[PDB]
Amino acid sequence: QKLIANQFNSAIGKIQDSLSSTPSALGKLQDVVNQNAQALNTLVKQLS
Amino acid sequence: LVKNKCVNFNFNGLTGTGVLTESNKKFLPFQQFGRDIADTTDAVRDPQ
């Protein structure tokens, strides 16, 4: 039980470290935001 | 000119509508009007 609890806390801390240090792990949200903003930007670009 | 009210300005070639407000951005002494994205003429420099 204590070994499993230690592995649980170590894995949770490793997730905190992994997402805090390594970027572009949130690509699936950032590309949604970027693709929507690019579409709206070129929609306003079409008026020129 | 007027301040802080929706007014149909014909501005020596540039004709739009909107409120006119004292702006904090600083131009270059030859530059006449500004834009940020897709001809959105956000700022103008009144000639007289």
Listing DSSP states for A2-22 in one string gives HHHHHHHHHHHHHHHHHHHHS
What is the C-alpha separation between B3 and B18, in angstroms, rounded? 10
Catalogue the E-assigned strands of B1-48.
7-11, 14-18
CA distance to partner chain A, nearest, from residue B20 (Å): 22
Please indicate the experimental technique that yielded this structure: cryo-EM
What is the C-alpha separation between B35 and B13, in angstroms, rounded? 15
Give the residue from A38, A40, A42, A44 with the most B CB atoms within 10 Å of its CB, the best one to mutate.
A44
Nearest CA in chain B to A42: B38
What is the C-alpha separation between A19 and A27, in angstroms, rounded? 12
Cross-strand partners of A43: none
Contacts of A47 in chain B (CB under 8 A): 38-39
Tell how many helices (H) and how many strands (E) occur in chain B: 0, 2
* Tokens read off for B32: 């006449």
Contact B14, B33 (CB under 8 A): yes
Sign of the alpha-carbon dihedral angle for B36, B40, B42, B47: positive
Cross-strand partners of B7: B18
Helix (H, G, I), strand (E, B) or coil at A38: helix
* Tokens read off for B12: 């020596």
